[PDB]
């Protein structure tokens, strides 16, 4: 374990667990969260919240005294996070959301408006619109392109297409999509609500070509020039072809990320390979299968990973770096692949610690510093160090369960 | 129980029994915000319910506040005269000896200032050494600070001789070892525990700090509150918490690994536990805050023992040797208050 965790509550210091300027806009978070570089040099962070129906924005260099902004949705999206996009085009943030109901809505939200002490917003800061039936045909994947133009996914393995004329409105461009043909086939059906091959992962290379990542982990790639299928690729007939159990992957997630010219692809085989090729004209050319190290049966979910240039490790020879972090319940675990060389052959794996020093040394009974005795000297122990938000949350989290502190050195209550 | 008011002006910070000399066992010092009072508990006729009172003898003046008060073996009675030996502590911070003869003062040693602690000053205890001849040697005083020290301060034929020991944290309670003046154990606030032999590094030291089962949690700040020897050849050592939490250690066989029993008062323990002096499985620890006390049995044979609930603070109580009696010291009085059980 070369790494070790440093948690950052951003309201710590303060009394207050609430910014006192948070402002709500309407429109007529505890599921997703990211952040995100503005051209101010400042991070913006926002969260979509369990329903998908408020998002959130505050700036992560001055939590308390800056504006964070709930922005508070008429519906929930259609397929939360995933059928949501945010991008700064030009001094504004954009942020497109297609909601359950078919509506595709836009935010504007001035760079300004995002540090400015305001509590109001003036213009257009949102439009509704309707440019596809999606009562039909259901999406359940929204994926940037560019400020006119980004594409749709079909949860029945079709593509849209959705370019922007003037600054509002959108229209659908149809992709040619003879997959479907399958259905000629006797295994497969139009009607079923299995053999689907939707998109579950997707990135833009070199502004023209879209690479897609199926259920069954096939690599297809969409030149944007032509709208066409250029390349086929079935991931998973290169590795030892077991016929037991591929899980076509049953959900939207992180299964790829290219830095360069490179590009890893997260396949499930016990949850365990990263393959790693090269994209070259266009050509994508097989590396190398690398698996992973993960025990205790491997039931570890992909939560991000982010391939990018090497780190400063406790080995010179490197090559690149992946970011990985998988999840299991709320435990995580972050691990970085060492690539030593061209050839994606030779690695290492570098762990590190999931619980930070406070943590462990509280759960493992090694913290010799806090002071002993009384059970008020425990609340300001307990309420130094987890905060106000969190102790504020516990203390509401007790009463709701109808437990409440009997008297000054009820002992009984400070160990719940 | 029967209960014997202090003097109107009289605020006491402290209470303890002679036990620690046979001759005086009877003999009971409240130290004050103007010196120490002794009492003597006699058996009346009574009704044989409480068949024990208590008979107000005197009260020695020293002008200044009493936080800590420890007989000394030296204590004799005489026809009547009673020869006393008190190590205290006082408002301005010193370590005292009051050798006494009734409520007069024939004597005082006097340690502070800077060869004296550099801080207040939590816990003081004596024990009279004697050599192989068995005139009185030397009488010793232990005590531990603020200032992370421990002071042993032994008064010989030749004259005092003055040691100083660092502690990694401020002295929270020291006592000698029974039957054996050679060991003695020293606390720190932080929940070290050590066992020293200062005739002599310092011989071992255990810790309740990470012991704590926290099947409960202890909390957050669980800061020692008092530790003990048990039995009469100090075969055991004692530990409690603020938090109520307490601990159980022997000291004989064979080879050890962990505490030898653990568990946890009703309530919090600002003063500490007093063990009995006849049961060691048994020991008492106060509510101190709303006037609760609770007995406790290590061995589990206690199912929460609250003998005493007064409707008032308690500022300090301790055991009569006899182990039925108990002397309790509110914030305006002494109550003698006798659990039929254990006569």
């Given at each position: ?204 290379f070199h502004e023209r070509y879209l690479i897609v990542l199926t259920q069954n982990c096939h690599l297809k790639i969409w030149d944007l020039t032509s709208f066409t299928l250029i390349q086929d690729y079935d991931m998973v007939s290169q590795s030892d072809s077991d016929p037991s159990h591929f899980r076509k992957v049953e959900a939207v997630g992180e299964y790829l990320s290219l830095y ?92 590190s610690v999931n619980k930070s020093l406070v943590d462990l040394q509280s759960e493992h009974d090694l913290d010799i510093v806090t002071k002993t005795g009384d059970v008020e000297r425990g609340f300001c122990n307990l309420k130094s160090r987890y905060g106000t938000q969190i102790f504020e949350r516990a203390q509401q989290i007790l009463s709701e369960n109808k437990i409440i502190m009997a ?10 | ?262 568990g946890i008062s009703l309530f919090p323990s600002l003063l500490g536990a007093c063990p009995h002096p006849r049961y060691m499985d048994y020991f008492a620890t106060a509510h101190s805050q709303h006037g609760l006390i609770q007995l406790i049995n290590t061995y589990e044979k206690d199912s929460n023992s609250i003998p005493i609930q007064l409707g008032m603070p308690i500022v300090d109580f ?26």
């Amino acid at each position: 374990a070369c790494l070790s965790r440093i948690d950052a509550n951003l309201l710590q210091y303060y009394e207050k667990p609430e910014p006192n300027n948070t402002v709500d806009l309407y429109v007529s978070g505890s599921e997703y969260s990211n952040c995100l570089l503005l051209s101010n040099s400042e991070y913006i962070c926002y969260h979509f919240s369990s329903r998908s129906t408020l998002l959130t924005f505050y700036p992560l260099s001055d939590a308390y005294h800056g504006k964070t902004i709930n922005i508070h949705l008429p519906n929930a999206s259609m397929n939360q996070r995933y059928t949501l996009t945010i991008q700064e085009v030009e001094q504004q943030l954009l942020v497109n959301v297609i909601l359950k109901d078919g509506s595709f809505l836009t935010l504007q939200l001035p760079l300004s408006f995002l540090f400015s002490s305001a509590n109001t917003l003036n213009g257009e800061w949102f439009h509704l619109q309707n440019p596809y039936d999606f009562t039909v045909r259901v999406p359940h994947f929204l994926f940037y392109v560019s400020p006119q133009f980004s594409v749709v996914f079909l949860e029945d393995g079709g593509l849209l297409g959705l370019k922007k004329v003037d600054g509002v409105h959108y229209e659908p461009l149809l992709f040619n999509d003879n997959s479907y043909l399958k259905s000629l086939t006797r295994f497969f059906s139009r009607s079923s609500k299995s053999d689907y091959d939707s998109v579950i992962s997707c990135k833009l290379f070199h502004e023209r070509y879209l690479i897609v990542l199926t259920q069954n982990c096939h690599l297809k790639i969409w030149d944007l020039t032509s709208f066409t299928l250029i390349q086929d690729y079935d991931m998973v007939s290169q590795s030892d072809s077991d016929p037991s159990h591929f899980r076509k992957v049953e959900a939207v997630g992180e299964y790829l990320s290219l830095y360069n010219n490179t590009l890893v692809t997260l396949l499930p085989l016990e949850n365990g390979l990263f393959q790693m090729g090269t994209l070259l004209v266009l050509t994508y050319t097989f590396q190398n299968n690398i698996p992973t190290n993960l025990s205790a049966s491997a039931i570890w979910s992909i939560v991000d990973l982010v391939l990018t240039r090497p780190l400063e490790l406790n080995v010179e020879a490197s090559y690149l770096n992946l970011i990985v972090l998988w999840k299991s319940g709320t435990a995580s675990k972050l691990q970085i692949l060492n690539v030593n060389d061209e050839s994606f052959k030779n690695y290492e794996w570098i762990e590190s610690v999931n619980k930070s020093l406070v943590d462990l040394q509280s759960e493992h009974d090694l913290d010799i510093v806090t002071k002993t005795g009384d059970v008020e000297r425990g609340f300001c122990n307990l309420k130094s160090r987890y905060g106000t938000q969190i102790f504020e949350r516990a203390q509401q989290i007790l009463s709701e369960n109808k437990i409440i502190m009997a008297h000054n050195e009820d002992e009984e209550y400070l160990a719940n | 129980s029967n209960q014997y008011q202090l003097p109107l002006n009289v605020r006491p910070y402290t209470t303890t029994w002679c036990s620690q000399s046979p001759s005086c066992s009877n003999l009971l010092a409240i130290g004050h915000d103007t010196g120490i009072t002794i009492y003597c508990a006699s058996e009346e006729q009574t009704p044989g319910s409480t068949g024990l009172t208590l008979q107000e003898l005197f009260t020695i003046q020293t002008g200044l506040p009493t936080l800590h008060l420890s007989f000394s073996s030296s204590c004799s009675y005489s026809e009547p005269v009673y020869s006393l030996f008190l190590a205290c502590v006082c408002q301005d911070n010193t370590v005292r000896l009051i050798i006494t003869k009734n409520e007069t003062i024939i004597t005082q040693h006097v340690l502070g200032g800077k060869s004296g602690h550099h801080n207040f000053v939590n816990d003081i205890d004596i024990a009279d050494v004697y050599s192989a001849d068995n005139r009185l040697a030397e009488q010793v005083i232990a005590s531990v600070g603020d200032d992370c020290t421990l002071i042993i301060w032994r008064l010989t034929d030749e004259g005092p001789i003055l040691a100083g020991y660092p502690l990694s944290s401020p002295g929270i309670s020291v006592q000698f070892r029974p039957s054996n003046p050679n060991q003695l154990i020293v606390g720190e606030r932080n929940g070290n525990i050590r066992i020293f032999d200062w005739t002599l590094p310092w011989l071992l030291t255990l810790n309740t700090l990470p012991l704590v089962n926290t099947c409960h949690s202890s909390g957050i700040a669980s800061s020692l509150a008092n530790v003990r020897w048990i039995g009469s050849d100090g075969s055991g050592i004692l530990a409690m918490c603020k938090s109520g939490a307490w601990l159980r250690w022997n000291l004989f066989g064979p080879k050890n690994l962990l505490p030898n029993v653990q568990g946890i008062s009703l309530f919090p323990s600002l003063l500490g536990a007093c063990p009995h002096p006849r049961y060691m499985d048994y020991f008492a620890t106060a509510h101190s805050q709303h006037g609760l006390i609770q007995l406790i049995n290590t061995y589990e044979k206690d199912s929460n023992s609250i003998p005493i609930q007064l409707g008032m603070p308690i500022v300090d109580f301790c055991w009569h040797q006899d182990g039925s009696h108990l002397a309790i010291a509110t914030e305006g009085s002494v109550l003698l208050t006798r659990l039929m059980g254990f006569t």
